[PDB]
Design a binder for this molecule. Structure first.
Ligand code: HEM
Length: 110
């Protein structure tokens, strides 16, 4: 099966490398990027991200609800466009399909 967990790990490496300040909104704020896999807050967040991807592909994802939740953290369209780029890189590095369609669905509610 597609190793979405590995894709997600690379995604966060790309995301926080390009936009380190985004990491301050998370429970693993301040943690060195190279050590995130050993952080409990990160493990939970990564798991939820993997789940969301599998839900988008599976057809059960609630893109409107995820979009609203992000707005509730002052995360909007600009951040998701940046994320779209980081995720494309991560997908490509693992021979996984691009997930732009899934991010676009979230964007349609931002
Ligand atoms: C590919 C793009 C993204 C995906 C698939 C994604 C997915 C998710 C998911 C599934 C959750 C859990 C929501 C829940 O528990 O109901 C979450 C939470 C969150 N996301 Fe994202 N997200 C993305 C982009 C971003 C970006 C660019 C930021 C910028 C800061 C961000 C900030 C947050 C924050 C602060 C939380 C809450 C963390 C917490 O509860 O400790 N997200 N995201």
């Amino acid at each position: 099966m597609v190793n979405w967990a590995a894709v997600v790990d690379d995604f966060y490496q790309e995301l926080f490398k390009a936009h380190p300040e985004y990491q301050n909104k998370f429970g693993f704020k301040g943690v060195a990027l190279g050590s995130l896999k050993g952080n409990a807050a990160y493990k939970t967040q990564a798991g939820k991200t993997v789940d969301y991807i599998n839900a988008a592909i599976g057809g059960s994802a609630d893109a409107a609800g995820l979009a609203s939740r992000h707005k509730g953290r002052n995360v909007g369209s600009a951040e998701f466009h940046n994320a779209k780029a980081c995720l494309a890189k991560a997908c490509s590095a693992h021979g996984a399909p691009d997930l732009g369609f899934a991010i676009d669905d979230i964007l349609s509610h931002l």
